[PDB]
Amino acid sequence: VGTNTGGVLVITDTIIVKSGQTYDGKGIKIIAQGMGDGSQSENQKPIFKLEKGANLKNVIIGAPGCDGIHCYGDNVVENVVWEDVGADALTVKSEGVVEVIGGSAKEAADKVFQLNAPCTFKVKNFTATNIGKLVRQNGNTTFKVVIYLEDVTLNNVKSCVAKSDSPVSELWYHNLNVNNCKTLFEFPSQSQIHQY
Numbered sequence: 001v002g003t004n005t006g007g008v009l010v011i012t013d014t015i016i017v018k019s020g021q022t023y024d025g026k027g028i029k030i031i032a033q034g035m036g037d038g039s040q041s042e043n044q045k046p047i048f049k050l051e052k053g054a055n056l057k058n059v060i061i062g063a064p065g066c067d068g069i070h071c072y073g074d075n076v077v078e079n080v081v082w083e084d085v086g087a088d089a090l091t092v093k094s095e096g097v098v099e100v101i102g103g104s105a106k107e108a109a110d111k112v113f114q115l116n117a118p119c120t121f122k123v124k125n126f127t128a129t130n131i132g133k134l135v136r137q138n139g140n141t142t143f144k145v146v147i148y149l150e151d152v153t154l155n156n157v158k159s160c161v162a163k164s165d166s167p168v169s170e171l172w173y174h175n176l177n178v179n180n181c182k183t184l185f186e187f188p189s190q191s192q193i194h195q196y
């Protein structure tokens with residue numbers, strides 16, 4: 001809850017958060033129009049583009065989730081709720097540290113989080129329900145990401161919690177609770193998965 005709770009911002013183009021800015025929604029809900037349908041199609045725009053060092057906080061992203069939130073690194077995404085994930089909820093598009101802290105995501109047909117560049121990706125105090133995967137390192141990429149899942153609770157994970165084809169990436173978990181998931185991690189070695 002914040003001072004904008006009960007308000008909805010209807011957008012027709014991606015919100016760009018410039019480097020060094022924190023976009024604080026104060027509880028506002030964002031609904032994108034003409035930017036996608038939230039399907040898995042690749043002809044959608046992101047709701048948000050966070051330049052390097054931009055932060056986002058306290059927004060609810062309504063359906064359609066479109067192409068979610070494009071992060072160009074060193075971003076904090078705090079108390080963001082994806083009421084219905086689109087193609088994906090958030091994508092790391094450039095190198096850096098990206099932290100998703102608080103909030104939740106719901107109804108991701110595929111992945112919630114998509115890692116397309118080397119990064120440290122931390123998901124903290126987050127719940128997700130009805131998802132295909134929580135985190136996917138871009139398919140067949142072999143750069144390194146380090147994933148931290150800390151105080152993450154997942155419900156109904158169709159594929160796996162996290163998948164990477166990189167032999168060098170790592171996944172660190174601490175209080176990761178997973179209900180209804182056949183396979184936790186799909187990495188080249190279980191030695192890349194660590195508890196802390």
Ligand SMILES: [Ca+2]
Pocket residue numbers: 067087088091114
């Ligand atoms: Ca995407």
Ligand SMILES: [Ca+2]
Pocket residue numbers: 038084085086106107108109
């Ligand atoms: Ca969805």
Ligand SMILES: [Cl-]
Pocket residue numbers: 092093094116
């Ligand atoms: Cl990318």
